[PDB]
């Protein structure tokens, strides 16, 4: 495209869990790492409460292709109990910036 | 003149592999051999008082507050359980001399095996009753008690189990006839308990629930070898099989770890043949023993078949010091899967106690325990009752690449412990 | 030499229409007739000690821990309330013989009607005071006590009620002149309480908050018919009207179901006229009675007019067995709407008590209770304060098709219950 | 024959600037001078009993439950701490006369300074031990105790600190040689504590964790002027430096506000030179005095250097009534910023106590306190550990526009209080 | 545009915090006020539980420009504790109403 664009990552909700067995409490953490062109731009962790990731990545014209990597990892409660985490779909839109239809200031 | 009574246990322990003391109980079994296995600090304190006494009539008031902590720290915040608060009036009725009218929260006539810490007849809770009625041959006692489940009731006509999340009250009506002399030194006791779920107006249970159930208990106590031997047969039907100690759970639904209801319907029956005792041979040997077969046969095919057999000898070097060995074996077979998982433990302890009997308490023990187990099935409890369709059901220990149960292994622990009842 | 004292009540009950026991209290009333209307088990255990005594001077130390559980299970973990821990030094000051200096959390001179279980002069809590000063005609007591509200203070100048979430302390300064002999066999006691909201530095209350208030009380006790009759008149202004027992709430801000602050401003007045007593008639009749009118007139029009009239006669079949009855009537009219909701309750019980008086405790009673009510308004607590403009406000029973109050209905329960103070 | 013992403190207080009583403690200090400076109501209740006694052999059972409430209301629900439950058998070993074997949760031989309410040797907790072995010159005591941390262990090999969230257990082994007679009236006591982190099988700690530590203590107590003086020197290495009283925290991981793990590594040492005592001058003057220097030197530079100097005189007009002053000074310099927080506090009280000593308890005081402080650094606990890189680190009070510490100011409070041990 | 449109505000998640220090509990509240052409159309507050705001605003043809103002305010815990709140980005789409492919009833 001949004009600069915005890559908007829509709200992504990720959440871990906590389990108490025999008075012993274990966590299952959900890690979300977002890289832009190989450089870490987000590194979030969720244990009990939901975490929402939504971002704007400014891609200009002529700088080159933009690669967004979303890596999500889940840790188990223990060696016997598998991880119990939630993560919504990754959705990405590309918009025009400074358009004449919708403006945002 | 406040009477201070109760029970307590507390100690320190290490595991051979590493860490704090681990605690070994077979999956499916409802009890574990407690000598060198007690896992936490427990204490019930009872502050009773006889507040009125005239001639033969008397009024006794009893409380009981219980604390259970993980014994991992000095400051350990806990939610104590107010277990008893009750008043009993003795010889208040002239028609029935020797009887007692009682009301409140009570530990009502519990029967237990100390070796494995198993209460096989326990309808304790809030209630009221008339007990110790002299009927000639025996003693008749009638009681009514309340229990409760955190869910199992719906405010409206529904087919979604998630709607059954309302507290369900259960009533237990108990009639006991004790102290029949049927042989020299032998005493017979027969009890019948009927339990039923009590539903509020315009509240309903899930479809196909057990609603109500029965428990029949026969128990024979024989005075042998300066001690006792009790042989008990119990048959429970329907709602009284989920717990099997005399309290009813007639809703059939339970909450998972994310507070979502799921069906644990307990239609079926439970047979329990138990024989436990404590004897003293010589002036230097004491002995506890237990042997029990318990078959819980359900209609959803999730019951169990449990064989337990254990001994606990004790040799007294001194009227203070003694050496106590405990050997126990457990074998639980799943009704759903047909797999049998088993375990045996041997523990050796040296104890200083306040007396010359195996029942003498203020005991301090230094113990070493070994336990070897082989487990072929387990319970699927990971995730939710929604995402997991096998939640709470017995599955083989290698189901679709999962790991259920404790596997095939062994472990040894050691440490010290104090146990007391006063 | 520990002194064991306290109070306890616990039992079991069933509702005629189904379920566990239901206890009936008309909406808008602050009390209910307690005989056969106890929904839960409540205990207060006090362990005191006279730790020092020389001649007439002494030091007494008293604790009090309170438990309140729902009598639905055996193991009922709760959060016990450390309600009292205080030390009182008696006869220490020579200039004022017979007086006491006390400090700590104390149950300071509580006046209540037992039949409805209603305290009308209760400023208990953490405080300190100088009590029982011999002033000639009577006895003068001064005290300072603390209360607190979970919210009502803002750290910055804000007009948004949601910002007023900081806990706010309140101080009550109380002066009482008691034991003034004005009648043959009758005494008079006057009391003045000033309550204020103690704000921190750079903290503020919502605009229009009461911020303080007054409570004037007069009580005449007359000894007649081997019993007593108490006639009390109380007038409270502003922050002392929310509770009406002597503690102050000057913030006028509450937390809704979702922990969002909302305005419960209590500017106005309250007038309470009460007459309650206990009378012995013959050698076989005892009788408690209460009659009270309480009018809370608030500036936001959310006050209430409350009429209560009740009797409880007991006939003594035997120095330990008695038959008790209790007939009570309650009628509450709202100020926002003007509708009246009323109820009447009749309870018949057979009780065994440790004494010959209606006050004799260790009592065990088997009761049947019947309450009939109709209700033309209720309180709106649905949703939350953010989306409900009527949250906490009195609205008619069918406001915009809603269902507020208990409606026009009838119910009967039964069961057994123990009550004791020792 | 129940033995009722314990401790309690409670009262009421106001501040001149407004609000409930505020109690002042310098940032970076681990103690505050306690006269008129207690923020809460505290009470330990202990119900012990001698359950068995033959000749010199004895068995004693001890319990202790603790309540700590904010003394802001009458009804204060709380989570009581089950602090002690243990059994001690005395004169049970024929080889070692006078030695006692104990097991359970115990307050094991705590040394403390009363003015600042500061325990410098407190390894209490669950454990077991053999105490008071007569070795001729002194008395040898061996004990093993357990502590725990809410996190620090990871089930799998990982580099993310957030994965180190499983609770870890620590063991302390304590050897004490006490009651050495060196000089007329002087007694020496030496102690060695080894603490280590007990990792569960297939569990690990973060890289660079201390995982173990030492504590060497030497205390000399001299009887002078009808009272005592204790001079103690303590040196701790590694995991014994984070807490500083004799329990180990070898994981070096702590939970933040939102329950995320972060590194609090405690590699380094701690030196504590303390001299505290109680003196009696004349028949009218008593005194407590305190001088402390505690240097915590850590590898991450987050240590401290704390100077404390305190005096508390008491003048007795009458054997019951006295006036007590207290002047205290704290000065803490941060290791990573080099700044200094200083504070001095003067409190004057009039007290009535059950005796003629500064240790005679059932004590009721009316006090006025004035504390003036100047703080140039504080701890950054804003946000959570993920978004804040300085979370838990000492920073200057004016760091990048933030406000850390209590600033430079002064404050005066007043009120009444009661303190008792029985 | 010659036809009426729909301005859809995608789910915006905002959340406050609660913090306990020395037994005293304080709140940091997140307030989101959404105005359409100066008229208040949303007033939301959050203390601990997350709150999600998503809306459809019908904009007709010929009436004029539509101005949506999102004002977010965060309240602090105390005088010395800064606010600790979270709020996701504001993303607004404009769609046709009664389009060809999709139709919702």
Swiss-Prot record, chains A, E:
Subunit structure: Interacts with host LamB.
Organism: Escherichia phage lambda (Bacteriophage lambda)
Function: Attaches the virion to the host receptor LamB, inducing viral DNA ejection. During tail assembly, initiates distal tail tip assembly by interacting with gpI, gpL and gpK. During virus entry to host cell, binds strongly to host LamB in an irreversible attachment. The binding induces structural changes in the tail leading to viral DNA injection through LamB trimeric pore.
Protein family (similarity comment): Belongs to the Caudoviricetes tip attachment protein J family.
Protein name: Tip attachment protein J
Superkingdom field: Viruses
Localisation per UniProt entry: Virion; Host cytoplasm
